[PDB]
Design an enzyme around this catalytic site. Sequence first.
Site, PDB file in Angstrom:
ATOM      1  N   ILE A  15       0.821  -1.214   0.000  1.00 47.53           N
ATOM      2  CA  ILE A  15       0.000   0.000   0.000  1.00 47.53           C
ATOM      3  C   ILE A  15       0.857   1.268   0.000  1.00 47.53           C
ATOM      4  O   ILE A  15       0.695   2.127  -0.846  1.00 47.53           O
ATOM      5  CB  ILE A  15      -0.988   0.006   1.193  1.00 47.53           C
ATOM      6  CG1 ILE A  15      -1.929  -1.214   1.116  1.00 47.53           C
ATOM      7  CG2 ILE A  15      -1.754   1.330   1.275  1.00 47.53           C
ATOM      8  CD1 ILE A  15      -2.612  -1.387  -0.234  1.00 47.53           C
ATOM      9  N   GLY A  16       1.766   1.372   0.954  1.00 47.90           N
ATOM     10  CA  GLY A  16       2.684   2.494   1.034  1.00 47.90           C
ATOM     11  C   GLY A  16       3.810   2.070   1.943  1.00 47.90           C
ATOM     12  O   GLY A  16       3.734   1.002   2.543  1.00 47.90           O
ATOM     13  N   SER A  17       4.854   2.896   2.023  1.00 44.24           N
ATOM     14  CA  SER A  17       6.011   2.622   2.879  1.00 44.24           C
ATOM     15  C   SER A  17       6.212   3.753   3.900  1.00 44.24           C
ATOM     16  O   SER A  17       5.242   4.426   4.280  1.00 44.24           O
ATOM     17  CB  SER A  17       7.270   2.386   2.033  1.00 44.24           C
ATOM     18  OG  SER A  17       7.103   1.270   1.176  1.00 44.24           O
ATOM     19  N   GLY A  18       7.456   3.943   4.353  1.00 49.13           N
ATOM     20  CA  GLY A  18       7.791   4.986   5.331  1.00 49.13           C
ATOM     21  C   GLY A  18       8.832   4.569   6.353  1.00 49.13           C
ATOM     22  O   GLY A  18       9.716   3.765   6.058  1.00 49.13           O
ATOM     23  N   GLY A  19       8.171   1.073   8.623  1.00 48.41           N
ATOM     24  CA  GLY A  19       8.191   0.124   7.515  1.00 48.41           C
ATOM     25  C   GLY A  19       7.055   0.280   6.517  1.00 48.41           C
ATOM     26  O   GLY A  19       6.735   1.390   6.093  1.00 48.41           O
ATOM     27  N   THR A  20       6.418  -0.833   6.170  1.00 47.46           N
ATOM     28  CA  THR A  20       5.553  -0.899   4.986  1.00 47.46           C
ATOM     29  C   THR A  20       4.167  -1.468   5.288  1.00 47.46           C
ATOM     30  O   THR A  20       4.033  -2.409   6.083  1.00 47.46           O
ATOM     31  CB  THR A  20       6.222  -1.780   3.908  1.00 47.46           C
ATOM     32  OG1 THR A  20       7.629  -1.515   3.889  1.00 47.46           O
ATOM     33  CG2 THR A  20       5.653  -1.496   2.535  1.00 47.46           C
ATOM     34  N   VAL A  21       3.150  -0.914   4.633  1.00 51.25           N
ATOM     35  CA  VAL A  21       1.773  -1.352   4.813  1.00 51.25           C
ATOM     36  C   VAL A  21       1.338  -2.176   3.624  1.00 51.25           C
ATOM     37  O   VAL A  21       1.454  -1.724   2.483  1.00 51.25           O
ATOM     38  CB  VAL A  21       0.784  -0.158   5.013  1.00 51.25           C
ATOM     39  CG1 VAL A  21      -0.666  -0.633   5.011  1.00 51.25           C
ATOM     40  CG2 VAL A  21       1.084   0.581   6.304  1.00 51.25           C
ATOM     41  N   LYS A  33       1.158  -4.079   8.769  1.00 50.45           N
ATOM     42  CA  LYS A  33       2.193  -3.098   8.832  1.00 50.45           C
ATOM     43  C   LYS A  33       3.501  -3.729   9.220  1.00 50.45           C
ATOM     44  O   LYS A  33       3.683  -4.127  10.326  1.00 50.45           O
ATOM     45  CB  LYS A  33       1.823  -2.016   9.808  1.00 50.45           C
ATOM     46  CG  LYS A  33       2.708  -0.813   9.733  1.00 50.45           C
ATOM     47  CD  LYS A  33       2.647  -0.031  11.004  1.00 50.45           C
ATOM     48  CE  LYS A  33       2.062   1.315  10.740  1.00 50.45           C
ATOM     49  NZ  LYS A  33       2.331   2.213  11.864  1.00 50.45           N
ATOM     50  N   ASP A 126       0.577  12.804  15.721  1.00 47.72           N
ATOM     51  CA  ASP A 126       0.615  13.020  14.293  1.00 47.72           C
ATOM     52  C   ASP A 126      -0.778  13.047  13.662  1.00 47.72           C
ATOM     53  O   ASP A 126      -0.997  12.516  12.574  1.00 47.72           O
ATOM     54  CB  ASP A 126       1.533  11.971  13.633  1.00 47.72           C
ATOM     55  CG  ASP A 126       1.954  12.364  12.223  1.00 47.72           C
ATOM     56  OD1 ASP A 126       1.879  13.557  11.880  1.00 47.72           O
ATOM     57  OD2 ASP A 126       2.304  11.474  11.431  1.00 47.72           O
TER      58      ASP A 126
HETATM   59  C1  LIG Z   1      -7.398   0.906   1.292  1.00 49.75           C
HETATM   60  C2  LIG Z   1      -6.446   1.046   2.508  1.00 49.75           C
HETATM   61  O1  LIG Z   1      -5.388   1.664   2.358  1.00 49.75           O
HETATM   62  N1  LIG Z   1      -6.837   0.428   3.670  1.00 49.75           N
HETATM   63  C3  LIG Z   1      -6.148   0.573   4.859  1.00 49.75           C
HETATM   64  C4  LIG Z   1      -4.935   1.282   5.052  1.00 49.75           C
HETATM   65  C5  LIG Z   1      -4.299   1.382   6.314  1.00 49.75           C
HETATM   66  C6  LIG Z   1      -3.167   2.112   6.488  1.00 49.75           C
HETATM   67  S1  LIG Z   1      -2.669   3.321   5.273  1.00 49.75           S
HETATM   68  C7  LIG Z   1      -1.421   3.842   6.108  1.00 49.75           C
HETATM   69  C8  LIG Z   1      -0.432   4.939   5.693  1.00 49.75           C
HETATM   70  C9  LIG Z   1       0.191   4.608   4.333  1.00 49.75           C
HETATM   71  C10 LIG Z   1       1.226   5.674   3.987  1.00 49.75           C
HETATM   72  N2  LIG Z   1       0.606   7.022   3.992  1.00 49.75           N
HETATM   73  C11 LIG Z   1       0.212   7.664   2.694  1.00 49.75           C
HETATM   74  C12 LIG Z   1       0.290   6.848   1.389  1.00 49.75           C
HETATM   75  C13 LIG Z   1      -1.074   7.185   1.989  1.00 49.75           C
HETATM   76  C14 LIG Z   1      -0.163   7.422   5.212  1.00 49.75           C
HETATM   77  C15 LIG Z   1      -1.127   6.333   5.702  1.00 49.75           C
HETATM   78  N3  LIG Z   1      -1.340   3.195   7.268  1.00 49.75           N
HETATM   79  C16 LIG Z   1      -2.279   2.262   7.527  1.00 49.75           C
HETATM   80  C17 LIG Z   1      -2.073   1.619   8.716  1.00 49.75           C
HETATM   81  C18 LIG Z   1      -1.957   0.224   8.808  1.00 49.75           C
HETATM   82  C19 LIG Z   1      -1.691  -0.349  10.066  1.00 49.75           C
HETATM   83  C20 LIG Z   1      -1.508   0.421  11.238  1.00 49.75           C
HETATM   84  C21 LIG Z   1      -1.601   1.808  11.123  1.00 49.75           C
HETATM   85  N4  LIG Z   1      -1.467   2.710  12.123  1.00 49.75           N
HETATM   86  S2  LIG Z   1      -0.925   2.240  13.564  1.00 49.75           S
HETATM   87  O2  LIG Z   1      -0.613   3.435  14.451  1.00 49.75           O
HETATM   88  O3  LIG Z   1       0.224   1.283  13.390  1.00 49.75           O
HETATM   89  C22 LIG Z   1      -2.203   1.338  14.436  1.00 49.75           C
HETATM   90  C23 LIG Z   1      -2.114  -0.038  14.635  1.00 49.75           C
HETATM   91  C24 LIG Z   1      -3.127  -0.726  15.323  1.00 49.75           C
HETATM   92  F1  LIG Z   1      -3.052  -2.133  15.526  1.00 49.75           F
HETATM   93  C25 LIG Z   1      -4.235  -0.037  15.804  1.00 49.75           C
HETATM   94  C26 LIG Z   1      -4.325   1.356  15.604  1.00 49.75           C
HETATM   95  C27 LIG Z   1      -3.298   2.023  14.913  1.00 49.75           C
HETATM   96  F2  LIG Z   1      -3.351   3.358  14.693  1.00 49.75           F
HETATM   97  C28 LIG Z   1      -1.869   2.373   9.885  1.00 49.75           C
HETATM   98  F3  LIG Z   1      -1.968   3.645   9.852  1.00 49.75           F
HETATM   99  C29 LIG Z   1      -4.953   0.810   7.415  1.00 49.75           C
HETATM  100  C30 LIG Z   1      -6.155   0.107   7.227  1.00 49.75           C
HETATM  101  N5  LIG Z   1      -6.722   0.018   5.944  1.00 49.75           N
END
Ligand SMILES: CC(=O)Nc1cc(-c2sc(C3CCN(C4CC4)CC3)nc2-c2cccc(NS(=O)(=O)c3cc(F)ccc3F)c2F)ccn1
Length: 250
Positions: A15-18, A19-21, A33, A126
Amino acid sequence: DWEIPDGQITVGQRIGSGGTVYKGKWHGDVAVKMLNVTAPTPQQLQAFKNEVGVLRKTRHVNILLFMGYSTKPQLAIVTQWCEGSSLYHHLHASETKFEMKKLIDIARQTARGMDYLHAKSIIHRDLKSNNIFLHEDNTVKIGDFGGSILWMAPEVIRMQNPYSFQSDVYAFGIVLYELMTGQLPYSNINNRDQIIEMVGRGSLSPDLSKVRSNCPKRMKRLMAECLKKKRDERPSFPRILAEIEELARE
Ligand SMILES: CC(=O)Nc1cc(-c2sc(C3CCN(C4CC4)CC3)nc2-c2cccc(NS(=O)(=O)c3cc(F)ccc3F)c2F)ccn1
């Protein structure tokens, strides 16, 4: 415990990086993640499990749902899969024509998740519209608390004690600004160093004349309180929530 054994998750599309999703499969859809670590030290493992412990304190509809964690083949955090895109995408890229009713609902839902996190003594650090996922276009899921400068409070921006409940409030204020104006702040100044300098010193703040005609004057005032350069002058979330829920009636 909430550990998921090796081989239970099928990792799919990145999906995206920064590790990786990634998108994954585990009893349906999940987000996985990946932290950038394959052989954790008995010290990284402890900061990881420590961060897992933080995520496990959350059970709320407007907070991204924690579902478990992986140690093998890699350190990874497993969450619910959200459908659609972030609030940032809707507001600034695709220009989703939201009625003011929906705009208020989003703020209300964001306020609920933040008030919840604050109750559990969690500072987000953030909050921004990129980190608010609009699951199925209706439900706010606050993520990414386990490039941010527009949402940084002056005291945080001062390059720095700075991360507090009140810096979250300020970032929430910027989010209200995004919602109530349809715009990012300081749009007529495309200069990072300048914004860091000016917001940091208190000479620049978001242009409130830009909040739309439709914005309940009661919301506009609340947004101004959240954006107080003076950290102690900011409302708390309980008050922010109470306020947004009351104007949501009218
Ligand atoms: C369609 C889709 O992307 N679905 C999706 C995406 C995620 C994402 S996306 C995304 C990023 C990708 C990079 N960027 C920009 C390119 C967009 C910012 C957002 N992160 C998540 C994601 C996935 C797992 C954990 C987290 N946040 S986290 O603080 O680790 C966290 C973990 C947890 F177990 C519970 C709450 C929580 F916040 C995420 F934000 C989570 C759930 N569903």
